[PDB]
């Protein structure tokens, strides 16, 4: 990924206050702090441990891309939604999408459901899938 990979180098280096060229317990441990509630023991190792061994960038990337690895673009996800609005109205009916999500495909459960619609942009019974897409990606809020 273009600016994607490129950026990693930039993040990578911040991800390391010593420059030892690797992210040890400290480097993460002492940036985070430069911000808030430095985690509890359980969290830090849990985190670093996700890595078999020392963080050689190649390991940062592989883990991060390994996580996203399965995502799609904005124009894509919003096109998927657009396959259920044959009219191109830019919105879906709330009950329709709540049923599509909960009883078909790989069914969501009462939890994934609550979590998804808590901050869903829904005016007058119409679920604005265009925004929602910006919300999930980050293009918006």
């Amino acid at each position: 990924p273009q600016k994607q990979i490129q950026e990693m180098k930039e993040a990578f280096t911040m991800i390391d206050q010593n420059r030892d060229g690797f992210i040890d317990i400290n480097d993460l441990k002492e940036m985070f702090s430069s911000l808030g509630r430095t985690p509890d023991d359980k969290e830090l190792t849990a985190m670093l441990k996700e890595a078999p061994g020392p963080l050689n960038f190649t390991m940062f990337l592989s883990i991060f891309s390994d996580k996203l690895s399965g995502t799609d673009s904005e124009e894509t996800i919003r096109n998927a939604f657009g396959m259920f609005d044959e009219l191109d109205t830019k919105k879906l009916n709330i009950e329709y999408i709540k049923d599509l999500l909960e009883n078909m495909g790989d069914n969501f459960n009462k939890d994934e459901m609550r979590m998804t619609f808590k901050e869903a942009p829904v005016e007058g019974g119409k679920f604005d899938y265009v925004r929602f897409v910006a919300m999930i990606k980050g293009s918006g809020d």
């Binding site: 009883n103 078909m104 495909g105 790989d106 069914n107």
Partner: protein, 155 residues
């Protein structure tokens, strides 16, 4: 009655896709048995599907793929109408004999006789096929009968 790999494989994909549209879990709802076999090219009737297992409404019984073969096969042995079978039937509603029939009659025949078609099921097929009612208010059943037997994608 007994299939070749070719046939068995297609049923799988179709069964697959339907299993997905009601929760992926290796089971299909007994209510969609009809709709599944229709996608394979057979034209079962509601009494046929009810005679091999099918149900009246969603959520009553689910069938694994291993219970489909028996069902599907059984469904391949029913009677499929032929061009002649249909023409003669419509002919009975045609007075003059010049291959015509009132649009209302057509709609009557489709939702009133036999295992009725829903009014929405009817106005859907008239659109897709494009049954053009002549000035007076009638139509040429010969066409409608070929088109329906010709299929959506027409060769």
């Amino acid at each position: 009655p007994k299939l070749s790999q070719d046939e068995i494989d297609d049923l799988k994909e179709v069964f697959e896709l339907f299993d997905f549209w009601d929760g992926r879990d290796g089971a299909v709802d007994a209510f969609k048995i009809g709709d599944v076999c229709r996608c394979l090219g057979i034209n079962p009737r509601n009494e046929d599907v009810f005679a091999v297992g099918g149900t009246h409404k969603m959520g009553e019984k689910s069938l694994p793929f291993e219970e489909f073969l028996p069902a599907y096969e059984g469904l391949m042995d029913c009677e499929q109408g032929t061009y002649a079978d249909y023409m003669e039937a419509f002919k009975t509603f045609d007075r003059e004999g010049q291959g015509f029939i009132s649009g209302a009659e057509l709609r009557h025949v489709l939702s009133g006789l036999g295992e009725r078609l829903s009014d929405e099921e009817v106005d859907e097929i008239i659109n897709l096929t494009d049954l053009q009612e002549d000035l007076e208010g009638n139509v040429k059943y010969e066409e409608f009968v070929k088109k329906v037997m010709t299929g959506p994608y027409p060769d």
